[PDB]
Amino acid sequence: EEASSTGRNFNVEKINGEWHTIILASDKREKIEDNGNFRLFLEQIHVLEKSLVLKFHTVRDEECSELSMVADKTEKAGEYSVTYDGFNTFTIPKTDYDNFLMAHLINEKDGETFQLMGLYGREPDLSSDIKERFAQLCEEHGILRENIIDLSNANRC
Ligand code: NA
Ligand code: NA
Ligand code: NA
Ligand code: NA
Ligand code: NA
């Protein structure tokens, strides 16, 4: 089955566990480029009662650095917030739990904003079909394909 974090039949426990950053996308491309703060390689999600604990690494000159953050439930079901390089809110518009997870995030920093979209896989890669479904979801949010970066060959340390 497939679900959205904002949908009535969402089962948050089913996103617990291993994940990998497959593709990232943004209407501010710099954020996810080589040295951007949002070029974040997911490793794990730990589902807690009213939060998610997100385990990431970043890469600078081919060296991995670990970082964790805690995303808290907001007043709206399926939305989470987290402070990281500004104030962030996010939802999971589509996941099948067992293969892929698609996130949509709004960042706000210094009075500005941008959108980030992420495609996460249980394995270090996903099928071209899923990758295409992600590109479609990006289009629905006004993010061009040229702003979509497949990171499936640089998601390892
Ligand atoms: Na810049
Ligand atoms: Na949306
Ligand atoms: Na959204
Ligand atoms: Na592969
Ligand atoms: Na569409």
Numbering used by the authors: 1 to 157
From the paper:
Recently, we observed a paradoxical enthalpy-driven thermodynamic binding signature in studies on a model ligand–protein interaction, namely the association of small hydrophobic ligands within the hydrophobic binding pocket of recombinant mouse major urinary protein (rMUP). In the case of rMUP we found that the binding pocket is suboptimally hydrated, a phenomenon that is increasingly being reported in other proteins. However, a negative change in heat capacity on binding (ΔCpb) is nonetheless observed in rMUP–ligand interactions, and is of similar or greater magnitude to that observed in typical ligand–protein interactions. The serendipitous discovery that rMUP binds members of the primary aliphatic alcohol series as surrogate ligands permits a rigorous quantitative assessment of the solvation contribution to ΔCp, since the hydration thermodynamics of these ligands are very well characterized. We conclude that the characteristic negative change in heat capacity observed in rMUP–ligand complexation is largely determined by ligand desolvation, with minor contribution from desolvation of the protein.
We sought to determine whether this excess could be attributed to expulsion of residual ordered solvent water molecules from the protein binding pocket. We, therefore, solved the structure in the presence of an alternative cryoprotectant, paratone-N, which does not bind in the binding pocket of the protein. The structure revealed the presence of four ordered solvent water molecules in the apo structure. By assuming that a given water molecule in contact with each solute occupies an area of about 9 Å2, they concluded that the increase in heat capacity on solvation of hydrophobic groups amounts to about 13 J mol−1 K−1 per water molecule. These data suggest that the contribution to ΔCpb from loss of ordered water molecules from the protein-binding pocket is at most about −50 J mol−1 K−1, since the crystal structures of the rMUP–alcohol complexes also contain between one and three ordered water molecules. There exists the formal possibility that disordered water molecules within the binding pocket might also contribute to the thermodynamic binding signature. However, previous molecular dynamics simulations on uncomplexed rMUP suggested that on average only 3.5 water molecules are present in the binding pocket, which is in good agreement with the X-ray data. In the case of rMUP, the entropic contribution that would normally be expected to arise from protein desolvation is not present. Instead, the favourable enthalpic contribution that arises from solute–solute dispersion interactions, which also indirectly arises from solvation (or desolvation in this case), becomes the dominant term.
